[PDB]
Design a protein around this ligand. Structure first.
Ligand code: PLM
Ligand code: PLM
Ligand code: PLM
Ligand code: ASP
Ligand code: ASP
Ligand code: ASP
Ligand code: NA
Ligand code: NA
Ligand code: NA
Ligand code: NA
Ligand code: NA
Ligand code: NA
Lengths: 396, 400, 401
């Protein structure tokens, strides 16, 4: 069964939590966290081909619409889900008030980012991660192929259908393998939370426990208040959605890599019957743009620091968190650290840099339990993609 | 229309030239030169696949000849076109005499095994070579693959011949698809172009005065006379209509001028070779090769710079052994890469050949004057570097 | 003919040996060793595709067995071949006793991996990366996984799935095939390539094989010869395969491996000898690349006979007892040692700190620098046996399945 995951997740959360309370953070890290990393190694392996392949073959569907409309749909969808997510985490940090005790001890060109979506060598872009420029190209290829196939010349249309196939052969094959790599997941998962529990979990106490609640409640309320709602309204069964997306949420949670989860996310989109036309473009894009769980986490962390330091958090202009949280979320990468790291950009937005070494002394507190906040946050980052995809998949 | 390029090129050259006279070199650079770079990003994207694919499928044609003869032809073609080009630039710099005023201010200054270059043509990992630019080793391998494919298809075993034809197809699928795209990316060209000369005009253009204007003339007149005196002529004699050639190569010459990347123009140069009906067997090998070997417009620029410096410093430019420019210019040209600066950079090698290095900090004070308007000289020089590939390809395409 | 190789190897060994006795180590290196390197460049070129392709198509054959059994077989084969090889080189260095004269001159001086963070590295994180940056091993791991997913994709109820899948599998074979076509052409260069390659090593390190260095060399090559006759010829004979047909077939791989000293660079030529002696891509296209970095038999001997050379010149008792700890670590070091044309030297260090005599104690570091003075001589021999052991094992296991 795939409750062997929950058997691993629960057993591991427990076995983990215990062993780290007894100073064996290092019996774990040296002994258990390779099996958790192995699992990840595998899932990374599949991300590059599965993404490329499935997007070329996902330029099956209509050039100007689908893509055009679907992009714009999903983009618009993504923005509002994220712009909401922070506001929800603002409200969570006005509710829980994480910062009384005084912070104890002390001690990119934007444009030259947009241009970087258009690769300069697509084999480069392939061989060095780089989902986003890959996406951009994989699309352009898959479209040129469509047009090649409706050529009058039938040597053109011969080879073109040829190519398009092998590419699908691959995309398909990746999907075949994401099934096998899921067998490891119970062990993979067990080992992964075993670590984070026996490590940062035995540190979630006092005001750190306070902030953690303010996050995860916010994350829960993102789902029920936004996803379940937006699903319900759009006529899709929320509860069927969860049942199907169980596998991606668990990987995303446990891995904390949105980008690492992508194959498993994409195979959940396949096996809930959406078109490669949609999912194979919305998913990778969203996998780095729709960080809903980050925008909450960042909105609730800006507050945590500005409370321990005791600014008024502008009773007025804290929309400039909301704004910058969005912006930072969009920027934050899909690796299992960067929301912390990027939180900085929404901090210098509220005017409290990691230079004023009390700020830097709270932020370092936060960072002490990031991988805890990460799991939750990540899982919601991914879910937001599936929701959005699914919603837009039903609109088209 | 593709006169929207000329509408962009002329509007941009003007809008540019003006704004840079009014100290807005930075309103441009921050606001207009991304659109120009976007265009380039795109064209870079295509170069790697288009080059690889088209050459494997361009090992359609006859193994020993075609390739063999065509290589040798185009190589021989390339050498003499370049060896001429410098001599034409020598004559331009004896004509215009760019160096009376003494290289005034001093102080603002500047800092390969040959064999371990030839060996570097044979790649050690063809996916490496692919994923890291590297046209030349790619070419080498793409050929070798394209040939092994031909031979695989005439195998007695028909599972061998099944899969082989299969592979060769998808590869063509791609090569084809790239060509489809170089058509789309051409749509951007008018904006792309407008922005790209908007920059160079509003930047180094408002600096082309006095003896800098003098050297520019002696280059561009030399570049014009490379066309009329060598291309138009070598085209006419070989029976191809010059004026149909220019009409067809209007797109590659405009990209190359505006981009200044020989190598970045390659897809558009290769889709001009296709749509003037030459064989992938020829063009998909002569074009990439020449795109980094047949720098004619460089060898002129370098011959006419060596003279500009040795005039401002006032050496006799050896009344006798300035053939050692001619020789080294060739050698430098061959070497100079297809990126949008290196003719300047490489000019150094022909300077230390005439015996005046960038150490003697008056030399390095002229050479830094030159470098002040290089992108002006680059547009010109680059366009001629590409044209010379088309000319030679076309000429040799007609001989075979 | 392919005796134009032997005509080049012999002419070159001679022309080389002579010119380096007359201080023209640099007339050679500047003039002859490019043609030797060109040859290598080419063979490198083919390695990546040939390996990848042939393994995906090599996941023709049965998923659970073949692979399963063949792996375990070849793995088990490999261990014992190597574990023997050192013991043979132990015995060679008890026989020839290379270390009387005290390590003269001190002051040559060199400096001094997480295992688990090696195993994890076999599973690539981006297969295009792995491909584009050498990295045979993770490539293997993935190429298999691909080739198997392909097999299963082809027996799908959906026949659009089974359409494109067979499509893909074909082009991949188109390539594999095409590489093999080319390893034939690149063999044409071999006589020149070979001539130039030994021309170098002879006119360079060969005019240095004198005295105790000649002593150790003998103790190596005799050990290497006796690895063949005593182990290969034997294990071949017993398994019913004709040794002398095997040698006839593997003549081309052995000569490249010897002359190139790159086990990994020889791989196309080795893999095309496996093809043209009629083994399945199912076997050879997995056992050959794996072994090309794991089955270093000629290394484990060289390393066992080098530990002894140094421990003799320094005069330790070489533990009359626990020198099995060489045997053990030599295996481990052999397994680790890469297929590039130096690393047995470099890795010998790990079996030295195992016997407790590091390159810090600068007389150790003054012997090890003597060894290294003639490594490329020991390398040719050692390497060729590293490859042979792959063919032997492949062939043996190829006949078992
Ligand atoms: C910030 C503008 C948002 C518009 C959406 C288009 C997607 C571009 C976002 C790029 C951010 C990714 C960061 C690069 C990570 C790697 O390196
Ligand atoms: C100079 C000899 C000419 C013979 C023609 C063979 C082609 C080799 C020329 C190589 C020059 C290219 C410069 C390398 C640029 C990159 O890096
Ligand atoms: C030493 C353990 C042996 C078990 C066999 C499994 C294969 C793993 C061996 C990895 C050694 C290769 C060295 C890495 C070279 C590169 O980098
Ligand atoms: N690990 C997170 C990123 C973050 O920490 O912000 C994710 O992939 O969603
Ligand atoms: N940018 C030129 C090189 C040069 O300026 O010499 C070209 O690529 O053609
Ligand atoms: N050159 C050897 C490695 C070594 O010298 O240990 C080989 O490839 O087999
Ligand atoms: Na996401
Ligand atoms: Na993000
Ligand atoms: Na050129
Ligand atoms: Na050049
Ligand atoms: Na080996
Ligand atoms: Na090894």
């Amino acid at each position: 069964v795939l409750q062997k995951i929950l058997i691993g997740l629960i057993l591991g959360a427990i076995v983990g939590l215990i062993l780290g309370h007894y100073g064996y953070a290092h019996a774990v890290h040296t002994y258990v966290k390779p099996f958790g990393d192995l699992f990840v190694r595998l899932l990374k392996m599949l991300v590059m081909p599965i993404v490329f392949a499935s997007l070329v073959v996902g330029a099956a569907s209509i050039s100007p619409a689908r893509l055009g409309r679907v992009g714009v749909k999903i983009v618009v969808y993504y923005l509002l889900t994220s712009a909401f997510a922070v506001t929800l985490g603002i409200i969570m940090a006005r509710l829980f008030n994480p910062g009384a005790g005084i912070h104890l001890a002390v001690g990119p060109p934007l444009v030259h980012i947009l241009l970087d979506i258009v690769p300069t060598n697509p084999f480069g872009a392939l061989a060095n991660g780089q989902v986003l420029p890959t996406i951009f190209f994989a699309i352009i290829l898959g479209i040129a192929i469509t047009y090649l196939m409706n050529s009058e010349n039938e040597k053109v249309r011969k080879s073109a259908e040829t190519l398009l196939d092998a590419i699908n052969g691959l995309a398909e094959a990746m999907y075949k393998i994401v099934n096998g790599v899921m067998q490891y997941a119970p062990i993979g998962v067990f080992a992964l939370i075993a670590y984070v529990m026996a490590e940062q979990g035995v540190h979630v106490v006092g005001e750190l426990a306070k902030v953690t609640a303010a996050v995860y409640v916010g994350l829960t309320l993102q789902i029920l208040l936004v996803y379940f709602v937006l699903l319900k309204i759009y006529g899709i069964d929320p509860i069927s959605f969860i049942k199907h997306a169980k596998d991606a949420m668990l990987t995303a949670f446990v891995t904390r890599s949105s980008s690492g989860t992508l194959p498993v996310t994409m195979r959940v989109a396949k096996e809930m019957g959406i078109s490669e036309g949609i999912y194979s473009f919305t998913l990778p894009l969203g996998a780095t743009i729709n960080m809903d769980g980050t925008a909450l986490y960042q909105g609730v962390c800006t507050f945590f620091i500005a409370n321990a330091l005791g600014s008024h958090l502008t009773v007025g202009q804290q929309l400039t968190i909301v704004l910058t949280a969005v912006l930072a979320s969009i920027g934050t990468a899909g690796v299992p650290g960067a929301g912390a790291i990027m939180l900085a950009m929404v901090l210098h937005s509220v005017g409290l840099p990691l230079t004023d070494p009390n700020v830097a002394a709270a932020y370092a507190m936060i960072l002490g339990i990031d991988a805890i906040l990460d799991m939750g946050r990540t899982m919601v980052n991914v879910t937001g993609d599936l929701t959005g995809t699914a919603i837009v998949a039903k609109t088209e």
